[PDB]
Amino acid sequence: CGGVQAEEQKLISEEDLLRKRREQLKHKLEQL
Amino acid sequence: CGGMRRKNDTHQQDIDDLKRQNALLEQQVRAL
Known about the structure:
- The complex is a heterodimer.
- Chain A is mainly α.
- Chain A is 84% helix and 0% strand.
- Chain A has one helix and no strands.
- Chain A is rod-shaped, with a radius of gyration of 14 Å.
- Chain A starts with a helix and ends with a helix.
- Chain B is mostly helical.
- Chain B is rod-shaped, with a radius of gyration of 14 Å.
- Chains A and B meet through helix 1 of A and helix 1 of B.
- The PDB classes it as leucine zippers.
- The entry lists the keywords 2D NMR, solution structure, H-bonds.
């Protein structure tokens, strides 16, 4: 324990990245 | 430090959960 904010910051941004991919996959099947 | 696993778990759950969805998602998209 020393920089939870830093490590936590990646966990958050990393989640957003997967979120975008999730909707994208749905758009490829739904839209396309 | 008294909220590392608590916060990390929230991210890990959402994360690992997104991968499980995206993984199975694209797996089906490949078929169609």
